[PDB]
Amino acid sequence: YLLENFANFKTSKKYQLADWRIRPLSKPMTAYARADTHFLLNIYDQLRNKLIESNKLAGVLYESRNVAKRRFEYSKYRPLTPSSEVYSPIEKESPWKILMYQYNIPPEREVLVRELYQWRDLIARRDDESPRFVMPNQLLAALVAYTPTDVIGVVSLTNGVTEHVRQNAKLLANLIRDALRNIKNTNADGILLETISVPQIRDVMERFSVLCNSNTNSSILLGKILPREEHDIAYSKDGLPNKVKTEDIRIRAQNFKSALANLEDII
Amino acid sequence: GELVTDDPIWMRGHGTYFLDNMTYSSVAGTVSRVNRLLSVIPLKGRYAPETGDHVVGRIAEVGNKRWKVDIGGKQHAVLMLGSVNLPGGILRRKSESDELQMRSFLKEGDLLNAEVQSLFQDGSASLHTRSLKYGKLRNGMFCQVPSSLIVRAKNHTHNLPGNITVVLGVNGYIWLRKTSQ
Amino acid sequence: RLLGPAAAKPMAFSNTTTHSEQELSLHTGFIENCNGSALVEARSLGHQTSLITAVYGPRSIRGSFTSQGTISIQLKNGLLEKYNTNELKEVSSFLMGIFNSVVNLSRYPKSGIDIFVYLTYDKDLTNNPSQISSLIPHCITSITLALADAGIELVDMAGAGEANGTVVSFIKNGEEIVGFWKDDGDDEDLLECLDRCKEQYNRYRDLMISCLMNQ
Amino acid sequence: MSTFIFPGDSFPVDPTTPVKLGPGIYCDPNTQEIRPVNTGVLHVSAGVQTAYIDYSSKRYIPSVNDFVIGVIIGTFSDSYKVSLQNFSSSVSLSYMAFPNASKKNRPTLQVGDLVYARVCTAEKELEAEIECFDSTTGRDAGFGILEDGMIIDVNLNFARQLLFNNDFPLLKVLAAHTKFEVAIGLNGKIWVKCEELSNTLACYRTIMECCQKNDTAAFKDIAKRQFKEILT
Amino acid sequence: MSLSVAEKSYLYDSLASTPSIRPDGRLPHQFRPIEIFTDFLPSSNGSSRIIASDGSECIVSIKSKVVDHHVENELLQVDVDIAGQRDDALVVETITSLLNKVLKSGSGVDSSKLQLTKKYSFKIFVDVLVISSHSHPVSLISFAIYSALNSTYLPKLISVEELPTFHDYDMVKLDINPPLVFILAVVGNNMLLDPAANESEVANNGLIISWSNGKITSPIRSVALNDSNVKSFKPHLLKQGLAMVEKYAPDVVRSLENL
Amino acid sequence: SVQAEIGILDHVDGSSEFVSQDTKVICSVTGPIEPKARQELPTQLALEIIVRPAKGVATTREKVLEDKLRAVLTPLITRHCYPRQLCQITCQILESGEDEAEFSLRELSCCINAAFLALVDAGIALNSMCASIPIAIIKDTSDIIVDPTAEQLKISLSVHTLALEFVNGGKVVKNVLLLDSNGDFNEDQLFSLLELGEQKCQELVTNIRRIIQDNISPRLV
Amino acid sequence: QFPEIAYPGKLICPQYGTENKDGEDIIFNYVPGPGTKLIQYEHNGRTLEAITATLVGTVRCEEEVKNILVSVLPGTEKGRKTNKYANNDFANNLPKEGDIVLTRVTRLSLQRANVEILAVEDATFSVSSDLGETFRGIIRSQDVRSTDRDRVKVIECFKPGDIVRAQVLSLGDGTNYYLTTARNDLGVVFARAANGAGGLMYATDWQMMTSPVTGATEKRKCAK
Amino acid sequence: IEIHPITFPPEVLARISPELSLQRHLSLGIRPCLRKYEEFRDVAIENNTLSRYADAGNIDTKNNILGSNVLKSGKTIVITSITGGIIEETSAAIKDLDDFGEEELFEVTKEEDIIANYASVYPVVEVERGRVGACTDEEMTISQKLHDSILHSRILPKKALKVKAGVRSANEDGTFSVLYPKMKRKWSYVLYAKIVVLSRTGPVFDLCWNSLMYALQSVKLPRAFIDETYEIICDQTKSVPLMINAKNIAFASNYGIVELDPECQVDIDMDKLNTVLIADLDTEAEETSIHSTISILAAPSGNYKQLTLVGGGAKITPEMIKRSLLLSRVRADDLSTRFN
RNA sequence: UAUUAUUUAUUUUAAAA
């Protein structure tokens, strides 16, 4: 945004997740790399003058010092309290708990995702790889959902396994099998009856019986006009009204409900 | 409206605005000078939250993936879902939304204490309850004092004679309760 | 059109031109719009009262998260003996303080109950010259009828009576008071007021169950 | 064959020959009869025989494969909120509807920015969707932010005649006076831009005056008089 | 502020105990400190400002009008205006209807003390302006209309029936017995006088009692203080509350008529 | 003879102005646009009908004028092809052309003709065409007159508003949209003016078709 | 021994009752149910936890020293057969979890279908105008079908105005309910062509609906 | 091919689709109101029940209603009372100028205004539907229709609302005595009506009109007099009934036109047009589905006062127009003589 | 679960790789 606006530098932004280990860098990646800092000094001059006019320069310089004061620390030696000045690759006491909610894993299989997350991390440290390289979360969820018993099941999964899983198929299969056999290994009224008992119920019932021994005009102005029921009439040919009886509409009601549900075939 | 200085070599702070290479005041108070930070401290002012404050706040509403807690500042402070000690560790989904499940244990009007984890650009506070020390207050009575009348100290809460414990929130909210375990 | 000509004046009747038992009639269930209906009528001495009460509830309030229900009672003038709108809302707040202690509010979370009382006819036949006190007991009995017809849970029945402007509403066969209203009246009198209203309360407490068990 | 028609009139096409339904005619879901609903000139093309009515309108209705000029009125987590016309219903513009899109990268578009997009979804019961690159053909040239310039309001018939019919002399009579760049949206919007503002201003006044004066032969005198006035 | 359900149960058990543990710990008959200003509106016949302990404030103005009582029914009208509320609100029309009953001409206020000729009398316009309120302010307003009516000065009358005339400078003092309204909150079996904000939120019911001429007068109400815990009360609590105001009302009138 | 114009207002989708005797009504239509939450219809188009008097504020008189004007335009619009949308039809009565305290048919008839023309200018899907005329009968000589003057209304026994629906070149009367009658009349007078009105509306649409065609044709290509 | 008919306030029985039967004393445990509440009463200065009815109808007792579910159903047994309390039964019987309801699609979003609950099971049901009593839910796209839950098209499964038979999942966000149609018997049970502007369509395939007279076909998420 | 539908009880049928439940009933010649095509609803009324002059012997003192009527048709309840006031009219006529020239110019230029000699009532409708707020669009439209129909049907001529002014005297110890008959000051009666509709189940304009026509035929104008600053006073008991011409009184009835569809009880029956006629519409099913209705105001002697013809739904043929007019007479002839 | 989310969006930290 700062390049396209303040520097007027229209650029495609795809050389971020690229592999910067390769040598020599390609001509597009060399032009992209130099562009990240070529105009940043001109952008600095513009943004600084605006922070002075807006009286926000003090806050930016304060926040900048807090960014420069960040301290890297291993996850094993990280502080227990969350802080914005210390960084760790793992900032949670149980990182596999957010995977069980992300992929909807039953809480009874937490002992499985624990032993798989810890095994995946130790393997990543041994070969100096990322945990997603040896086993992404997509494959970690499949192993705990499908629970491959045999060694063939660990290899044949719909997404496809990594090479670390392919080599450790026997070790991983022995881990899910053992963790699943440990799951199968894992799997009142007398409180109030003694206070009042039975002979004392005759007291609370006798209390009841003699406590509650202490327990028509047609119309005045509108009582004989409002509670009137429905009266339906029909005009004959001579113009005289004819009141239908409440049993005639009863015939109509039961004749409709019976003839309504009596439809089970239409050509 | 009046001029505080005509020296361009200054860093303007609160109660102070820049205009025509000169510096003016926006409030009524005393001029402060710290290194190069020029600011004006007004007389009356609400609580200004900062990073790392043992405050006491009341829940206003249960919002989308967060809570609105009444700290006493210009705006409501936000308490994110991933910043508290959840009951069962995580959410038990799918069944209900995130907001409805929060009201089961943290409804509107509940009183608690937390620490300001960080600040937003507008000055809003971001709280967190990631320790056993912070929790939901009970077994006591609530009282309120001005935030400026809170002397700074190492300890935020203190034990008092008579089996009573005081929670002096730096935002002015105090919770007097019986001493707990 | 409406209101009519502003230059017209209402008719004026001159007083110099030519010159125990409180009857009761109860009905319920006759309005199709609402859930529970009621119609109470009373004619004692030279004062006849007839009012209609409708209950629309329980209505689920969208987005509400209240633990218990909320009762809304509204008095509305009818066609004779119009009272001022301020005093009508005063009796409404007094009535809401009564049924909030009677209606099972915990049985209706995130919902409300709206009461509508229409003072359709309040006749008065005094010979020659607060008048609202004689209608509060009749309004309480009308709401309890329509609330019972609407399938709403009511902790015990509620009735009241008048004793020279003194209106007292009882519960549990007069064991506990749920409302107190007194306008004008005299001094020192209190034991006879609670007695005359309590016997009038039991007269209404069983007569409401009469029409509610029939039909 | 072109004739003026009215709603409720008899459709001058025999029900024997299959005819394609276009904008202007309506097929009753009950009587299954084809009847007009708009007022204008009826068009029938003599493999496939389609029929539609050309009616005068200004309220744009979203239709797929239409090029429109929208205004961004809302930024969100995964999509923009774009307004194709005032008071109308807003349309959706996803962040992944851009060339070289990424879920980890937010586009540099803010509110008030003019975008030239294509309608890719126009369900009547849903919100319309637009995109800044053709998802069917992979096109991306011409789509995107319209920086600076000036936008003009015209009726839908004037905008459609300017984008499709190459015989409309408005573009030609404008090039005779100044070099510019134009973007025509089927929602009644026309975005122009020149080197100097004085040239863009004269282009705005001409397109405004030519839209109300339906005399196509008068476009030459409009641009002649308009460009000659700004010199004072 | 609002109260959490945790501290709500804490106050209920402490207030309903046989030793009433008030939040501020006062006695069930002690009041909070009150500041009352009087005679500051020159354009009005009488005025007063009252400031409660919880920041509650109320302003009263008293105007007069010469009217014929043979055609004017009520000679005392109360017009309440709570800040932040509409004029047709329920919380406003109830107090407006209630204050016109405690100050009704011929009932709580005798119409004889503001009469002029056989044909004419004075009509008192009591205008109330509630700037801030935390609880039911019907008791705080009654104190304000008391100090204002006891500092009100009406023009002196100068006296075949003709229209009345008044002196240019000299004015008479309005000597009227102004009724007083008290609020009582019942919490279980304890009766509380002058309930605070948090106290009135956990109460089981409420009582409104008028007081004029050194005795209890009409009207009296039993309106609720919170729709949550509305509980019916034993008639002995009504008598205990009605008898408790008789024991401490003269202590109020003596501390209120000093001005 | 009646006068009518189209596309007079700028900031609306479709406008019109209908004149008859002395009654002048300017109508505007905007739609389909975003409806309000209390207005949206799940399957079809929602209408907002507003008629405003020439003098004073909008009273209950114009409320029944809206309800009648709504009953005419609703079956005249293909509402189903605009689901969850809104159409704002606003009629402004410039001159009443009649005694407002006594009659309101000359304004209702013009609002119908102005709304239909404005709906044509806006581009809303219309199922057919429409025409509306006022009808009255004189007291002394019980004569049926079409489009009566203001003086003839004050000497009439009954007043009538006839709104018809025309299809197929404006010759087939598909239905009778609105026939509002007030006064004194019997069954014989009804069909006498109803037959007379069907041929006076028939020449109105024939003149309306000519009016709208003289304006829309120069717009198109 | 309790009277059959009951009024709001009639004392039924305390929470403890005993009787001698066959020389074996038993104690009844009466718990409150839908239509009662434990109310303390005083007659000699000592309280008791008695059960008091608070409805208009008949009292019915069930079982789970045993416990007795004492409840009062509203109305008379003759009135329940006539179903004279249809409007009252809809509001009092809120849709619990796992119930089956008949809704109406009122709003179509790209990832959800807002509906309006019209009935609920009591096949017998219960359904109530200016009554002001109506419930609403949301049918999410993930709960439309069981085969391939993610990446669906609700425009091809529902339309505004269609009647949908869907089983509830849980209370969504308090404002709305969460429904599902991932079953063969759940889906559109009554729709009409062109958003009600056509003829009555009937379900045929698992995702195909057609009208006999008009012959037009429209894709839905039917139920059969 | 052949596919059987889904069965539904009649209760949920009316809720999921009022149009479907309407056509299903019409297949059996019945309506969802459990009535046939041309079956109305019986009415029961009580006149002067709320009036000040209810008892000829014990005339109420502190009453205001000059006449009332309590109507109930089916399950809807209509309560209509009529109060009243009096207004003093000024003589702004050119006759008082005593000039022949100006008076002759007035007679020549004056145009005839037939409806200017008639007045109307100012009704206030209050349909209780369990809501709060201002006047509903329904309440306002009904009030305007009652005012416009009363005025055009010529029920209340202005000369019929004049006040025979009196002068009450103060003779010796007879306290007061009133005498009745050109007088200087003049007066005219002003009639106010308030209508309260309860348990509304459909269109209630026809019920409000019929209830008002009964209450109008039962109002008495209290005699007025002046003392001897002197405003006018009405008599405490003496009164004169309102002289309403029974020629012009009319009654209301609404009718609808419904087209039957073959899909509700094989290809030859699909093109079988058969539009039916419904009398006295009611229930939400008929109010919403039927979009082509006819409301008529029919007076005796076959005279019609008002008629609205909306053709939104099915096509209305002259046969059903003649049928509705004739069916309107048989009800107006009944309602006008069923009680009096 | 703020590198999380709100769909006609009340998010008020979307920045780095």
UniProtKB/Swiss-Prot annotation, chain A:
The keyword rRNA processing applies. It comes from Saccharomyces cerevisiae (strain ATCC 204508 / S288c). This is Exosome complex exonuclease RRP6. AMP binds at K13, Q16. Changing D36A: Temperature-sensitive mutant. Abolishes exonuclease activity and increases accumulation of 5.8S + 30 nt RNA, 5' ETS RNA and U24 + 3 nt RNA. It comes from the Eukaryota. GO terms for biological process: exonucleolytic trimming to generate mature 3'-end of 5.8S rRNA from tricistronic rRNA transcript (SSU-rRNA, 5.8S rRNA, LSU-rRNA); histone mRNA catabolic process; nuclear mRNA surveillance; nuclear polyadenylation-dependent antisense transcript catabolic process; nuclear polyadenylation-dependent CUT catabolic process; nuclear polyadenylation-dependent mRNA catabolic process; nuclear polyadenylation-dependent rRNA catabolic process; nuclear polyadenylation-dependent snoRNA catabolic process. UMP binds at K13, Q16. Disulfide bonds: none annotated. Mn(2+) 2 binds at D36. Zn(2+) binds at D36. Keywords: Exonuclease, Exosome, Hydrolase, Nuclease, Nucleus, Phosphoprotein, RNA-binding, rRNA processing. Belongs to the exosome component 10/RRP6 family. The chain holds residues 330 to 617 of 733 of the full protein.
Swiss-Prot record, chain C:
Belongs to the RNase PH family. Keywords: Cytoplasm, Exosome, Nucleus, RNA-binding, rRNA processing. Its main location: cytoplasm. It comes from the Eukaryota. GO terms for cellular component: cytoplasmic exosome (RNase complex); exosome (RNase complex); nuclear exosome (RNase complex); nucleolus; nucleus. One of its GO terms (molecular function) is RNA binding. Non-catalytic component of the RNA exosome complex which has 3'->5' exoribonuclease activity and participates in a multitude of cellular RNA processing and degradation events. In the nucleus, the RNA exosome complex is involved in proper maturation of stable RNA species such as rRNA, snRNA and snoRNA, in the elimination of RNA processing by-products and non-coding 'pervasive' transcripts, such as antisense RNA species and cryptic unstable transcripts (CUTs), and of mRNAs with processing defects, thereby limiting or excluding their export to the cytoplasm. Gene3D superfamilies: GHMP Kinase, N-terminal domain. PANTHER family: EXOSOME COMPLEX COMPONENT, EXOSOME COMPLEX COMPONENT MTR3. One of its GO terms (biological process) is nuclear polyadenylation-dependent rRNA catabolic process. The keyword rRNA processing applies. Present with 7380 molecules/cell in log phase SD medium. SUPFAM superfamilies: Ribosomal protein S5 domain 2-like. This is Exosome complex component MTR3. It is found in: Cytoplasm; Nucleus, Nucleolus.
From Swiss-Prot, chain F:
Belongs to the RNase PH family. GO terms for cellular component: cytoplasmic exosome (RNase complex); exosome (RNase complex); nuclear exosome (RNase complex); nucleolus; nucleus. GO terms for biological process: exonucleolytic trimming to generate mature 3'-end of 5.8S rRNA from tricistronic rRNA transcript (SSU-rRNA, 5.8S rRNA, LSU-rRNA); nuclear mRNA surveillance; nuclear polyadenylation-dependent mRNA catabolic process; nuclear polyadenylation-dependent rRNA catabolic process; poly(A)-dependent snoRNA 3'-end processing; RNA catabolic process; RNA processing; rRNA catabolic process. The gene is RRP46. The keyword Nucleus applies. Its main location: cytoplasm. This is Exosome complex component RRP46. Present with 10800 molecules/cell in log phase SD medium. It comes from Saccharomyces cerevisiae (strain ATCC 204508 / S288c).
Swiss-Prot record, chain G:
InterPro entries: Csl4, CSL4_N, EXOSC1_C, NA-bd_OB-fold. Keywords: Cytoplasm, Exosome, Nucleus, Phosphoprotein, RNA-binding, rRNA processing. Its main location: cytoplasm. Signal peptide: none annotated. The keyword Transferase does not apply. One of its GO terms (biological process) is RNA processing. One of its GO terms (molecular function) is RNA binding. It is found in: Cytoplasm; Nucleus, Nucleolus. One of its GO terms (cellular component) is nuclear exosome (RNase complex). Present with 5550 molecules/cell in log phase SD medium. Non-catalytic component of the RNA exosome complex which has 3'->5' exoribonuclease activity and participates in a multitude of cellular RNA processing and degradation events. In the nucleus, the RNA exosome complex is involved in proper maturation of stable RNA species such as rRNA, snRNA and snoRNA, in the elimination of RNA processing by-products and non-coding 'pervasive' transcripts, such as antisense RNA species and cryptic unstable transcripts (CUTs), and of mRNAs with processing defects, thereby limiting or excluding their export to the cytoplasm. Component of the RNA exosome complex. Specifically part of the catalytically inactive RNA exosome core complex (Exo-9) which may associate with the catalytic subunits RRP6 and DIS3 in cytoplasmic- and nuclear-specific RNA exosome complex forms. Exo-9 is formed by a hexameric base ring of RNase PH domain-containing subunits and a cap ring consisting of CSL4, RRP4 and RRP40. Belongs to the CSL4 family.
